[model samples]
Target chain A: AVLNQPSSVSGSLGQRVSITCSGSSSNVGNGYVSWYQLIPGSAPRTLIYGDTSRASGVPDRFSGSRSGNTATLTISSLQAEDEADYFCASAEDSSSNAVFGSGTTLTVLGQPKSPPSVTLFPPSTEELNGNKATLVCLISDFYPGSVTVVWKADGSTITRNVETTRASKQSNSKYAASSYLSLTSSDWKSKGSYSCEVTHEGSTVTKTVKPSECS
Target chain B: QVQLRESGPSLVKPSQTLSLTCTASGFSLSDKAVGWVRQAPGKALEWLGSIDTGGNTGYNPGLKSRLSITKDNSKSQVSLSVSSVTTEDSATYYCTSVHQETKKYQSCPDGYRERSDCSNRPACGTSDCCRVSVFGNCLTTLPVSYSYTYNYEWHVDVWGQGLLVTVSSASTTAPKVYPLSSCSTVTLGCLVSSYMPEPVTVTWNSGALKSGVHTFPAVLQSSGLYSLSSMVTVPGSTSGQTFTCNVAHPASSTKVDKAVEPK
Candidate 1:
């Protein structure tokens, strides 16, 4: 346990909040603490390094400090854009050390929650590659960009050959992605039913298709 | 304000006992448990063992008798004492808050079983009718199944940064010799990998034959090991001759040989 952090925190707009990352003398005291911002659908960026030195382009509103073995990341005048996951990292020695906190999610209070809209495209003869069938789940219009996709067939949930793409931001700033599930022709022709359930913002949108309905 | 600190020497001699202690505050030892976990310079985290809140100890089966744990309830501390430390034991050790929940239900909750269930209804008055809703939120029907964990999971709440303990030693790992899948009908190759203290010797038994020997350069892998490949071509005269690749390394007295007669 090199780094310790809470799972999540919240702050209202225009207010200030801090996330604490506590480590040990070997991990934190011996090296400088660097804070990183991770927002889904984009690359993670370093916010602060060497404790208080902010990376280029990082706003002054975000500050970092180390007191003893603990390092705290402070965000002032919190805005909707500040809602993202923050992680504190450091090394064991100057030669080379890499350690990351369990990570904390910074939630901006009053920030709107957007649920993803889901569409299920069932299997068809033309789309089937002879012996295999594919079911596609298209998800769109999501903010905060976290979702889970489940594929169900007949009376059982599928745990194989399911693929979900990374989220891609749209022009409206929403995120989109697709999940695909492969099925054998025998499994798809059972007419029992095939469904794709996409969950976002604590709600689930499920769409299904019966093999009998397809040619 | 809960913070844990690890204290120990930075290096340990090979085959010696490695000792580490974790000092903590803002938490009680009797209320929350503590565990020792380690990660090699470039390896996954390994959970060695833990002292439970009940004052009992559980350990990793792999570590066996060589590893032991002790805690000072009065000092709010726990320590790991690993015996016969080696290169594999070279790692950064971290002390962590361990939460152990032991409870039993009359029956296990759902999803722990191999099968689970979900309900589905058709989109129309007809039993088979599925798709409907021409507007945006289209309606559809999916399959339905009915059915069905250890309720206990590990959530290491706090990790004391870490104390790095490197076990220093000179290694003499033998090279593993493997025959390569036919370089060709007339060519044979041997793969020598996972060897240490490099500058190993690889030769074809061809003390009796002649052909261009394609001995690749020995390269050091990220794992701090070395690997080398050697291929030999036999003339059509002895094309079918069984060729054996011999490897000699400082780690072994006898030369390692791999036979490749891919007939």
Candidate 2:
């Protein structure tokens, strides 16, 4: 491919953040690199262009550099408002030839830093078809957005027949997500408990339900 | 812009030949490349074969021996032929353009004037300062202090709907009928062989049940034919009842039916 950027990076207030743009030697070795800052819902603005040259009106806190086949963009004294997506571009030729790294989301850590509230709902017995059933787990009120949901059967982790929806932003700025696990009626009858575990940042929240109580 | 359409037989018999033609419009067959992509039931896509406007052809190694891709510039079409067909060869095929290009350029870091022909200048490579020409015009000499940028182009933008083909043989043997006491069901098995262009529907008929009893999906056997088996539950006494398994394939005008009297 042309160039690549990390999907995301996060930093605390006053901390420094750095993102890299990687390219093939044939392209990066012979190319000039540039960086841009993208605020959500707005067009991207040039931050640093021509390696270390800052774009007009851009802050001096943002700098760009190159090393081998990779280009770097560094932000010093990261402020809460500095949270935005960053992108890097490389010029491979004089024919207006250029390629852009995908993009990197910079999340400046703020408020709460809390775990998400999780709710595990047992598969309704009415929806059971002889031997098949579906259970849904709802997760909400999460900060920092990204989260993972794991399903366990009788205290053992399970991966089959599990489907999780993407985390969506709520009006409150918190995130909400849901996951479903399909199981055979026999498995439901035998298992003591089914747990939905939601992991956000470093904390995990879990909700467990028993088949006997659900029916 | 290029448009492609795939046309071919829907069915082919075992040990027979399968042929498909891809007709193109809006582009010259001598200037663009076209290829065949296929997908089997519940399987990922596969690149069957390809032929460029230059008349050169390539095939997937697994199908190389039995596959041939050719182009006809006069007709603005590409054709694919495969020998010795079987049920596994059944799939939906598509034809699409395959053209791509990548080029690089050089620009000064200071946002100064940029040139793409600097590397080609004789003295430019040996020394920092040298003269260069662009589009046959000589430009001022300068030290090389710029990097390159890469650009890409993709020409294949349109795709045709999939065309499905199933290979099998017409039934050459009688079907077998049996009773499964363990399941309290009567089983009717119809074996169809050497038929091409699949998606055959099998229906069951019986005096004890409705005329259009549902049958399980037909299974393609390892031998590259088709085996359709359907079972229906009947009361303790299924005697004196006639059961029929009828198979309908697009390759044949009339449906094949097999009837059996249960004892």
Per-candidate iRMS values, in order, are: 19.2, 15.3
Candidate 1 on B1-263: residue-level lDDT in tens?
45788998665678899999987677443455677767674344556777765667766556748878888868877788999988899877878765444322232132221112113433322332223234423134431222211122233446677776767653566776666432032555665655665456777873543355555445444455555566566665776567788778854553776676643
Native-vs-model 1 lDDT? 0.66
Candidate DockQ values, in order, are 0.01, 0.02
In TM-score terms, which candidate is top?
1
Error of 1 at A138 (Å): 1.9
Docking class of 2: incorrect
Q: Enumerate residue pairs that collide in model 1.
A: A1-B159, A2-B161, A155-B145
TM-scores of the models, in the given order?
Answer: 0.40, 0.38
Q: Residue B213 in model 2: shift from native, Å?
A: 47
User: What lDDT is reached at residue B165 by model 1?
Assistant: 74
Displacement of the residue B263 alpha carbon in candidate 1, Å: 54
